[PDB]
Amino acid sequence: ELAQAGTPAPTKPHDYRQEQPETFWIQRAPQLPGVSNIRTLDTPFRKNCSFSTPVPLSLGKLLPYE
Amino acid sequence: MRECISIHVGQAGVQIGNACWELYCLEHGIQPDGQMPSDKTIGGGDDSFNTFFSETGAGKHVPRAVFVDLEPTVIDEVRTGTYRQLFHPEQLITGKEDAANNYARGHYTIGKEIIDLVLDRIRKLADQCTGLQGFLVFHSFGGGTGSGFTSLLMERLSVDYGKKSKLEFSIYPAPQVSTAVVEPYNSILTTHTTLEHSDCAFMVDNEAIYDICRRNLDIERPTYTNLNRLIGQIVSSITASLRFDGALNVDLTEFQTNLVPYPRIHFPLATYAPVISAEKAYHEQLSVAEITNACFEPANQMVKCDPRHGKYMACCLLYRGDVVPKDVNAAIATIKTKRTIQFVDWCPTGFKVGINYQPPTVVPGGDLAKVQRAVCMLSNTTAIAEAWARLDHKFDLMYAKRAFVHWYVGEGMEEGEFSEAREDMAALEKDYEEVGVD
Amino acid sequence: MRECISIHVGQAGVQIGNACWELYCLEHGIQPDGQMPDDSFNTFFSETGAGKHVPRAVFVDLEPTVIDEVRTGTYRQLFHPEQLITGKEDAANNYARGHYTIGKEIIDLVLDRIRKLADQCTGLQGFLVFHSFGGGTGSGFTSLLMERLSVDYGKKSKLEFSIYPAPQVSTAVVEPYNSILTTHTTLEHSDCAFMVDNEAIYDICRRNLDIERPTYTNLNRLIGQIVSSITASLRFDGALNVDLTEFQTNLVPYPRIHFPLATYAPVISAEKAYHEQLSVAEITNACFEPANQMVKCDPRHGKYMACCLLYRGDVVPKDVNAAIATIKTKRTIQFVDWCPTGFKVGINYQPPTVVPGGDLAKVQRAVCMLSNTTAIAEAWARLDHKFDLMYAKRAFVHWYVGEGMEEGEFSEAREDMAALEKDYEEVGVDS
Amino acid sequence: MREIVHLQAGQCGNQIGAKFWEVISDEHGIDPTGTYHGDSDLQLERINVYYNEATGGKYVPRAVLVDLEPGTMDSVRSGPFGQIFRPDNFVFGQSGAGNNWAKGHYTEGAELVDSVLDVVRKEAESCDCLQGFQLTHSLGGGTGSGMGTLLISKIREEYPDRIMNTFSVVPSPKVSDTVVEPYNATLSVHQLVENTDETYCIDNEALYDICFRTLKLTTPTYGDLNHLVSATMSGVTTCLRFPGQLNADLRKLAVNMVPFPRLHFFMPGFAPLTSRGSQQYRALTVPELTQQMFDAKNMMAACDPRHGRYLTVAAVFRGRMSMKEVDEQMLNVQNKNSSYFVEWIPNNVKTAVCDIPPRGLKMSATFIGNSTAIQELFKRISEQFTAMFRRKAFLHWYTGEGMDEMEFTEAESNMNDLVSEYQQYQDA
Amino acid sequence: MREIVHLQAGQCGNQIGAKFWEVISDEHGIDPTGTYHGDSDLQLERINVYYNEATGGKYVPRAVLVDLEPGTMDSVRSGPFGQIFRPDNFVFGQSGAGNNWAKGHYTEGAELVDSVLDVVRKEAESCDCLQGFQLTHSLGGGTGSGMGTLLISKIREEYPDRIMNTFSVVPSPKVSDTVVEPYNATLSVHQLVENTDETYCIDNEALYDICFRTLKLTTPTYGDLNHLVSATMSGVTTCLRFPGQLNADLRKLAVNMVPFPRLHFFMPGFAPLTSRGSQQYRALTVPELTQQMFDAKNMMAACDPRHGRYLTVAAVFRGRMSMKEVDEQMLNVQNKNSSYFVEWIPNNVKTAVCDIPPRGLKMSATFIGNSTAIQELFKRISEQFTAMFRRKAFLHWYTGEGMDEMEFTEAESNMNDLVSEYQQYQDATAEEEGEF
Ligand SMILES: Nc1nc2c(ncn2[C@@H]2O[C@H](COP(=O)(O)OP(=O)(O)OP(=O)(O)O)[C@@H](O)[C@H]2O)c(=O)[nH]1
Ligand SMILES: Nc1nc2c(ncn2[C@@H]2O[C@H](COP(=O)(O)OP(=O)(O)OP(=O)(O)O)[C@@H](O)[C@H]2O)c(=O)[nH]1
Ligand SMILES: Nc1nc2c(ncn2[C@@H]2O[C@H](COP(=O)(O)OP(=O)(O)O)[C@@H](O)[C@H]2O)c(=O)[nH]1
Ligand SMILES: Nc1nc2c(ncn2[C@@H]2O[C@H](COP(=O)(O)OP(=O)(O)O)[C@@H](O)[C@H]2O)c(=O)[nH]1
Ligand SMILES: [Mg+2]
Ligand SMILES: [Mg+2]
């Protein structure tokens, strides 16, 4: 019998198929050992190889801290 | 720079390729038109798509894959459907007449006509690539093209490219159900091209996916679209170490070192966890220790073979999402204490661990749930020997009365292929029992 | 940290499980969704990455006609859909069908599900087994589930809350075959085993709670109160808390005897709750009255070997010791000569909770007793009389032989029952 | 300087220690946070006997808590004085004994002693001159008795030339709330008689009898019982901390109260116990303390020295007072009752005086007594043990855990020899 | 004036090295851009030990970072403190080793060492008076143990009268994550025993064990594990950079520890480590450092010194502090633990005191312990290698690169001679003289 509360209200807008889950890694993304350059707004865990390519065989990219 | 050339040969290869390349486009943000909506003006630091796509000055990203088939009726769906602008027009190689469930027809007669065009497109992809990790093969044993034309393809690739890695994703015939009659002939004559001409070979059969997608994903009647989503999910998990940045990185030759103890033994067991519906994701606690035991559970295996009667020889674990290294070592520990599983006495530490940061993605209209953790496992087990011997009995039962042999002799091959492919398979089964001796 | 994985088998097991888990949800403040509107819930409810609490219970039956209304009713969203295992074609009140023929197809699913719940326990106290001696699945399937659990898990605690057939009124005719063939196999495969009898609880609700027309549901609420008071010290703190192993080692003088009796007091209606004085002396005096017993046997013909008391609520250790002292002097009660002090005292702080639509009322203090007694032989010796009377002309035996069991299993179960009775009497024989 | 290391074993040991650290932190002026908040300088002069020094002028007790069940540990840490203890000092096992002596002494207690002997050696070597140890445990349960005897048995060879006290909750016939309790009592007294400098017998029957007859409290909770026993446990080591006109440390009590090495079972009492109604009407006078003490009701054991002989007697007084009345009254009680003392030891009395009284009280006294009446207790335990062992009752919980039958036989024979040794001084 | 050239090999070396340059730049007061923002004047008095002057008052480290996979080099570049390194020093290949010791030592790493030794020679000759080298690497990989041991052999021939430290991550049995770890391990221990002056065994079990039961830490990430590794390696050479009352650099430490040139496998340990819930319950005093330094919990290897005998030990203290307690406490543990310390050598404890404490702490200490209990790790590596090499498992991955099967046999004999060599010194009679 009696009254039951419903599902808790979402504090922020949520939508699957586009949203990245909150992880320890994505919380400490700029402070982790093993994380490459962060130039992506979707996920900071997408690889960047601007520094790694040789001077030949390279397109004109942006070096980190430059 | 790191990148893999994926070839899809057969009607099974094309339909696997459709469901796996729609996962790659959604993972990297590619439209079916080929353009990337992101990086409209600037922001070119993202090059995670470099393993699978080639950048063109118009913004178009074409896949580095070739579709090979001998019947146009399944490849014209790709040329007409929603991905008709993404693929290159010349990377969908189309034959004239199919091999028609025949090893000899697709190896000695029809397979010699389009071999030159396929080797031309491979060389164009091989000259375009700058550092090649390996080749990925998607094919089926039971078909004429998937067994016959594939067998000549690995021998020509071995002569051209010597040290390149060659991974195999083969559709092994299921033990009780199937779709054809001459499957034991086509599956036993392809043992030579998967023994000496394949660096790694993952076997899958359809019925071990059928019961998984029935009792775990709670949908009452799946079809071939739902099988290829789970098959294509493993290939993304294997190549996620190259594409997305992680704490531990595993190259293609990294797990070949830790899963191939001898060149004759290169047949791992693929499994994936978790595979749950959106209904059950609301109910079940999903943790690192609770997904590393689903890979070890024999009911969730992807090959109809029981590792309880076998013994493990090596293991490779690939993690996705927030899997901290604390719970990896805590969960591997309790795996070693339980005595239900068994390890060989000459491999004291049998585990290889790779951790990637990016969680897996989902597809609209899909059946898997949006989770934070995932794991795929590639384990060597002696229980493949009982998987071969079940089909080995059916081949000897069929060949005693000499049935369908006139369909193979009249195409151009000798009758000595059947006795030879029976004998070296028997020596390979005799090989597996000896390694399993403690 | 502590955990107790319950298993429920049989239609009686499912009906007891519904009454037990309704009490658990209202006691811990759980909605039937499983949501919270503190870690006392951790012994029964598993946390989830969605915030839900899923119970640590496994429902087993061969009947789909009782699991479905669990899957359709109020708690349809609480239980995980794979915890309610359902077979087919029933067992039809047969030990042989439930053990040798039908039970062997679903035993792998139950043991796989038990492994998927026993991997989550950092420390597990023990399994609780609820079953009925009469029906096929409660008799046949439980007999080999105990053997497979003993092989798989070494020395984990196994508690039983079994339903022994009543001597006067019952459901079936082949219930002596079902009851004897489990008593033989629950000797070496059970750690502790309580018995409840239906017609005595029928007498309890008739003359105490003023309900002259009860059902199984008013019966099942009393067993749920007993099971709650057993695990009450585990869930909540108290002055002298008691675990499962403590009364398991304080109630078995010998390994062959593990058959105590569970009583409850007070059990009174709301109108009588306003009147009566509920002191700890007045609740421990009702557990010794044979009219307030739960098994149809009188301890005045027997001897008390060991006793355990579970006080719950506004109890004081001083008045508890005084109430024990006044009991020990009267000659209506009688202890054995080799056990000068047979008492074990457990005290919990939190008072028991009631459910709406129930029968009890607001009570400040209650007691549950587990006394091992020499009075239970008259239950077994009369069942030895009922079984041998009906085995004399070999009635209903072809219904058991037809599944694959040997005739000699009946004869060796008779020698086991005779030996258990001849084990039994020498302990009652004084020095 | 002279430092005492405290040990707590079992649920009873944890409850009796939480109240004991509650009453002497108030004696030395310590807030629940831990900082010293006093009003004199004599309180701060001797703190290192029980406390350590920490950062910011904090004091942490020199105590270690031992249990095999984390349920009681959480209540101790969540109590009023649970913040003062260091979290490293709590040692708990994840699987208890369950009122079983064999689990605590052979199987389960063997793994847990490596941590306790690590911790107790870690902080006892920090003492510049370790004075002794102290243990509180209960014989009615196997958590603090099976391992509590093993902790004594391991610390003896490690630190031989020390003194250790134990406060044993010796079980009672009427407050016997566990069935296997005679097994736990008998098998632990055997270990207690051989490896202990000093033993104390505290009984819940006497604690209930005091709070009924004397204090007139309607509800004697365990907090009131812990108040009564810790008022004596603080009262026995007062000369170490508070200076007096005649001092006597724990070793000076032991040399005058242990005439023979197997006779160290003493039973205590506390003199100024008064109800609230009778508090207004009593007079604080020196003979009032000894007359309320030598009353046989006031004792803290289930035995009467009227049935026995007072072997040796010690009195420790608290408060600035004249000692001529102390010497006069104790001579008077020695000479008036000439049949309750042995003939072969003249001057059976050891006397000590401390200047500083307990907080909120004017004068106080504490009495330690060795008598032959303890053998009444030991025979009562042994008669129930031999009435239940002889039918092999509850033996499968002991013979199946790594114990043969000869340990029960030698435990009875050693206890039989001990009561015979105590009996020979009743007559001779 | 006394320069230490830093060497990083492998992915594990770069994660350790990146945290190490972060921890001592904070100690010397260096912003991530490269300038100096501090409050004291003695921080620049001795800064050329690890740093090299650049234009505009900029300091760049004297470190070279070497790997065979370019994925780690971009991560250590774009990290939190990766901007200060000179981009010339990042040397890397394109194809990884593949967790293979033979690729890193014979085929793949044989071409990368020409570029590395040119950079190492270019950076070591610029020092006015070179003190020695220092290497951080892991023995469980291919590009750290395969090619790092080759860097060991070339440098020792070129610079004989120099002192070389190494920080080897010895593999672990329980938390092993690679199948071919004993293959990579026992083929490199022979190179470390012959051509290395000091070796420190750092184990991941002990880093996990310290982070679990001592720090009471929730999630011990690899950054937290490398936080402890950078602690001892910053504190072992603190007498070189800061003045003190009793100064002792790493050469004076090397003289007092190594009795014979085959005995240089040590155990590190950092003393003042407390948890968040127990720090304000503990006083910071010299006996409290000595008790937390000498127990087996804080040892950073999988060695229990109870099974072995302590051969020779160190304590390097930090902070303004009166060293009666330093001269008294290690004497007290010398006299008490008579059995643990070998009686063949008297008063084996070496003592150093540095005035300048670490930032935010008033007192600290560091431990180096040479014990015979290190031989249980080599025996464990021996038995895991013996059980698998006997079946010729994973051998084609190694014998296909040119090395024959007798290199394994001599690698067994060299390690079995090593474990027996420690065994004689453990059980030896001091009060006797032999035939010599
Ligand atoms: N897992 C999976 N297997 C498939 C799928 N589609 C086809 N197959 C496999 O394909 C086999 C049938 O033979 P095919 O591979 O189609 O034959 P083919 O390669 O076209 O060669 P021919 O028909 O002789 O020209 C069946 O045994 C299936 O196992 C699919 O979508 N998923
Ligand atoms: N005490 C008690 N016993 C019950 C209750 N409900 C059913 N029973 C017992 O259950 C017995 C009959 O078996 P069921 O539980 O109905 O069914 P089953 O155990 O699954 O066995 P099958 O009917 O053969 O499948 C009767 O003899 C009753 O004694 C109940 O609510 N309380
Ligand atoms: N005097 C006194 N006795 C106590 C106290 N707590 C428990 N007891 C007695 O100790 C017995 C149970 O002790 P138990 O908890 O089993 O001790 P453990 O097994 O060492 O933890 C009961 O019979 C109580 O009478 C207390 O605070 N004071
Ligand atoms: N202590 C510590 N160990 C690490 C770190 N990174 C990796 N490891 C260990 O190194 C092992 C793998 O080394 P690997 O990367 O193959 O060495 P490499 O091939 O030479 O770069 C793993 O078992 C890790 O436990 C780190 O930052 N700190
Ligand atoms: Mg085809
Ligand atoms: Mg039924």
DSSP state of D358: P
Q: Which amino acid is at B434?
A: E
Q: How many CB atoms lie within 10 A of CB C357?
A: 9
Chain breaks in chain D (C to N over 2.5 A) after: none
Q: Under a CB-based contact definition with an 8 Å cutoff, are residues D184 and D99 in contact?
A: yes
The subunits that touch chain B, with at least 3 C-beta pairs less than 8 Å apart, are A, C, E
Give SS3 for D38.
coil
> Distance (Å) from the C-alpha of residue D120 to the closest C-alpha of chain E?
13
- Where do we find the tokens 């901390």? D241
- Where do we find the tokens 């996920």? A43
DSSP for B28-85, written as a single string: HT--TTS--SS-SSS-TT--GGGGTEEE-TTS-EEESEEEEES-HHHHHHHHHSTTTT
Per DSSP, what are the bridge partners of residue D35? D58
Helix intervals (H) in B51-210: 72-80, 103-104, 115-128, 144, 150-160, 183-188, 206-210
Q: Under a CB-based contact definition with an 8 Å cutoff, are residues E99 and B257 in contact?
A: yes
DSSP for D322-340, written as a single string: -SHHHHHHHHHHHHH--SS
Chain breaks in chain A (C to N over 2.5 A) after: none
How far apart are the CA of E196 and the centre of ligand 3, in A?
Answer: 62
- Catalytic residue, candidates B207, B254, B290, B429: B254
DSSP for B305-366, written as a single string: --TTTS-EEEEEEEEEES--HHHHHHHHHHHHH-SSS-B-TT-S----EEEESSPPP--TT-
Enumerate residues 6+ apart whose C-beta is below 8 A from B279. Answer: B218, C81
Task: Say which CATH superfamily domain C376-430 falls into.
Answer: Helix hairpin bin (1.10.287.600)
Distance CA D196, CA D261 (A): 9
Maximum separation of any 2 CA atoms in chain A, in Å = 75
Q: Is D83 annotated as a binding residue?
A: no
Give SS3 for B202.
strand
Q: Which candidate, D392, D417, D387, places its Cα nearest to that of D405? A: D392
Q: Under a CB-based contact definition with an 8 Å cutoff, are residues B393 and A42 in contact?
A: no
In the numeric block, which tokens belong to residue C321? 């010791």
CA E405 to chain CA centroid, nearest Å: 31
Beta strands in D20-169 (DSSP E): 63-67, 90-92, 129-138, 163-169
State the sign of the Cα–Cα–Cα–Cα dihedral A36, A40, A43, A46.
Answer: negative
Q: Under a CB-based contact definition with an 8 Å cutoff, are residues C309 and C262 in contact?
A: no
* Cis peptide, bond prior to residue B325, ω within 30 of zero: no
In terms of C-beta density within 10 A (0-12 exposed, 13-18 middle, 19 or more buried), how is residue D394 classed?
buried
User: How many secondary structure helices (H) and strands (E) does chain E include?
Assistant: 15, 12
Distance CA B116, CA E324 (A): 87
DSSP for C302-347, written as a single string: S-EEE--EEEEES--HHHHHHHHHHHTT-SSS-B-TT-S----EEE
CATH topology of domain B269-383: 60s Ribosomal Protein L30; Chain: A; (3.30.1330)
Enumerate residues 6+ apart whose C-beta is below 8 A from D39. Answer: D29
Per DSSP, what are the bridge partners of residue D202? D169
Per DSSP, what are the bridge partners of residue D175? none
Enumerate residues 6+ apart whose C-beta is below 8 A from B360. Answer: B233, B236, B237, B320, B321, B371, B374
Q: Which candidate, B10, B23, B8, places its Cα nearest to that of B64? A: B8
Domains of chain D: 3-257 (3.40.50.1440), 265-374 (3.30.1330.20), 375-425 (1.10.287.600)
> Distance (Å) from the C-alpha of residue A3 to the closest C-alpha of chain B?
23
Length of chain A: 66
Method: cryo-EM
Q: Under a CB-based contact definition with an 8 Å cutoff, are residues B92 and B75 in contact?
A: yes
- Where do we find the tokens 């039958």? D405
Half-sphere exposure of E354 (CA within 13 A, CB side): 23
In the numeric block, which tokens belong to residue D4? 């005492």
Length of chain B: 438
CA E298 to chain CA centroid, nearest Å: 15
Atom of ligand 2 nearest to the CA of C94: 24
Q: Which candidate, E25, E50, E18, E30, places its Cα nearest to that of E241? A: E50
What's the first-to-final CA gap in chain D, in angstroms? Answer: 43
Half-sphere exposure of D359 (CA within 13 A, CB side): 14
CATH of domain B2-268: 3.40.50.1440
In the numeric block, which tokens belong to residue C351? 């008072």
CA D113 to chain CA centroid, nearest Å: 22
- Where do we find the tokens 């060497």? E7
**Torsion angle in degrees (nearest 10) through CA of E94, E95, E98, E101:** -90
State the sign of the Cα–Cα–Cα–Cα dihedral C6, C7, C13, C15.
Answer: positive
Give the Cα-Cα-Cα angle C406, C408, C412 (nearest 5 degrees): 135
Q: Is E38 on the interface with A (CB under 8 A)?
A: no
Q: Under a CB-based contact definition with an 8 Å cutoff, are residues B259 and B380 in contact?
A: yes
Q: Which amino acid is at D277?
A: G
CA D168 to chain CA centroid, nearest Å: 6
Distance CA E365, CA E232 (A): 9
In the numeric block, which tokens belong to residue D180? 């296997």
What's the first-to-final CA gap in chain C, in angstroms? Answer: 46
CATH topology of domain B384-438: Helix Hairpins (1.10.287)
Distance CA E197, CA E188 (A): 15
Q: How many CB atoms lie within 10 A of CB C201?
A: 23
Distance CA C307, CA B167 (A): 70
What's the first-to-final CA gap in chain B, in angstroms? Answer: 43
- Where do the CATH 3.40.50.1440 domains begin and end in chain B? 2-268
* Cis peptide, bond prior to residue E173, ω within 30 of zero: no
Phi, psi for residue E92 in degrees, rounded to 5: -160, 155
> Distance (Å) from the C-alpha of residue A11 to the closest C-alpha of chain E?
27
Q: Which amino acid is at B162?
A: G
Chain E partners within 8 Å of B248 (Cβ): 177
Per DSSP, what are the bridge partners of residue E17? none
Distance CA B429, CA B423 (A): 10
- Where do we find the tokens 């209650």? C366
Distance CA D205, CA D300 (A): 8
Nearest alpha carbon, ligand 2 atom 31: C216
Q: Under a CB-based contact definition with an 8 Å cutoff, are residues B270 and B234 in contact?
A: yes
Q: Under a CB-based contact definition with an 8 Å cutoff, are residues E133 and E7 in contact?
A: yes
CB contact under 8 Å between B322 and A25, yes or no, is: yes
Q: How far is CA B45 from CA A59, B338, C295, D50, in A?
A: 11, 46, 78, 65
Q: Is B293 on the interface with E (CB under 8 A)?
A: no
Per DSSP, what are the bridge partners of residue B290? none
DSSP for E352-412, written as a single string: EEESSPPTT-S-EEEEEEEEGGGHHHHHHHHHHHHHHHTTTTT-HHHHTTT--THHHHHHH
- Where do we find the tokens 């004989």? E160
Atom of ligand 4 nearest to the CA of E96: 19
Q: Which candidate, D300, D273, D276, places its Cα nearest to that of D288? A: D273
Q: Under a CB-based contact definition with an 8 Å cutoff, are residues C231 and C28 in contact?
A: no
Distance CA E155, CA B267 (A): 44
DSSP state of D373: T
Long-range contacts of C403-412 (CB under 8 A, 24+ apart): C403/C94, C403/C96, C403/C97, C403/C100, C403/C101, C404/C96, C404/C100, C404/C101, C405/C95, C405/C96, C405/C99, C405/C100, C409/C181, C412/C184
Three-state secondary structure of chain A:
CCCCCCCCCCCCCCCCCCCCCCCHHHHCHHHCCCCCCCCCCCCCCECCCCCCCCCCCCCCCCCCCC
Three-state secondary structure of C65-133:
HHHHHHHHCCCCCCCCCCCEEECCCCCCCCHHHHHHHCCCCCHHHHHHHHHHHHCCCCEECEEEEEEEC
Q: Which candidate, D275, D237, D303, places its Cα nearest to that of D2? A: D237
Per DSSP, what are the bridge partners of residue D6? D63, D134
DSSP state of B422: H
State the sign of the Cα–Cα–Cα–Cα dihedral C287, C288, C292, C295.
Answer: positive
Phi, psi for residue C369 in degrees, rounded to 5: -115, 145
Atom of ligand 1 nearest to the CA of B71: 25
Q: Under a CB-based contact definition with an 8 Å cutoff, are residues B358 and B322 in contact?
A: no
Q: What is the gyration radius of the CA atoms in chain E, in angstroms?
A: 21
Q: Which of E75, E138, E180, E208 to mutate to test the pocket of ligand 4 (most atoms within 8 A of CB)?
A: E138
In the numeric block, which tokens belong to residue D204? 């819940």
Distance CA B132, CA B126 (A): 8
Distance CA E436, CA E433 (A): 8
What does DSSP say about strands C261-265 and C365-373: parallel, antiparallel, or unpaired? Answer: antiparallel
Per DSSP, what are the bridge partners of residue C60? C9, C85
- Where do the CATH 3.40.50.1440 domains begin and end in chain C? 2-260
Length of chain E: 436
Nearest-ligand number for the alpha carbon of B14 = 1
Distance CA E333, CA E325 (A): 12
In the numeric block, which tokens belong to residue B167? 């991974």
Q: H or E element: which one contains C318?
A: helix C317-327
Q: Under a CB-based contact definition with an 8 Å cutoff, are residues A45 and A26 in contact?
A: yes
Enumerate residues 6+ apart whose C-beta is below 8 A from B422. Answer: B188, B392, B395, B396, B399
- Where do the CATH 1.10.287.600 domains begin and end in chain B? 384-438
How far apart are the CA of D16 and the centre of ligand 6, in A?
Answer: 54
Give SS3 for B293.
coil
**Torsion angle in degrees (nearest 10) through CA of B340, B345, B348, B349:** -50
Beta strands in B119-267 (DSSP E): 134-140, 165-171, 200-204
Percentage helix, strand, coil, to 5, in chain B?
A: 40, 15, 40
CATH topology of domain C261-375: 60s Ribosomal Protein L30; Chain: A; (3.30.1330)
Per DSSP, what are the bridge partners of residue E51? E61
Distance CA D319, CA B391 (A): 98
How far apart are the CA of C184 and the centre of ligand 6, in A?
Answer: 21
- Where do the CATH 1.10.287.600 domains begin and end in chain C? 376-430
Q: Which candidate, C246, C159, C238, places its Cα nearest to that of D184? A: C246
- Where do we find the tokens 């051969």? E311
Q: How many CB atoms lie within 10 A of CB C63?
A: 19
Q: Which candidate, D298, D277, D144, places its Cα nearest to that of D228? A: D298
Q: Which candidate, C323, C336, C365, C327, places its Cα nearest to that of C431? A: C336
Strand order in the sheet with B134-140: B92-94, B65-69, B4-9, B134-140, B165-171, B200-204
In terms of C-beta density within 10 A (0-12 exposed, 13-18 middle, 19 or more buried), how is residue D192 classed?
buried
Nearest alpha carbon, ligand 4 atom 27: E15
CATH topology of domain C2-260: Rossmann fold (3.40.50)
Q: How far is CA E427 from CA A44, C72, C387, E338, E376, in A?
A: 57, 76, 76, 15, 15
What does DSSP say about strands C126-132 and C6-9: parallel, antiparallel, or unpaired? Answer: parallel
Q: Which candidate, E173, E162, E170, E174, places its Cα nearest to that of E189? A: E170
Q: Which amino acid is at B163?
A: K
Q: Which candidate, B146, B211, B143, places its Cα nearest to that of B176? A: B211
DSSP state of E257: H
In the numeric block, which tokens belong to residue D251? 């070793």
- Where do the CATH 3.30.1330.20 domains begin and end in chain B? 269-383
Q: Is B286 on the interface with C (CB under 8 A)?
A: yes
Chain breaks in chain B (C to N over 2.5 A) after: none
Half-sphere exposure of B311 (CA within 13 A, CB side): 15
Chain D partners within 8 Å of C344 (Cβ): 177-179
Helix axes C142-152, C107-118, angle to 10 degrees: 40
Picking from A30, A33, A37, the nearest residue to E74 by CB comes out as A37
In the numeric block, which tokens belong to residue B37? 């909506």
In the numeric block, which tokens belong to residue B181? 């009659």
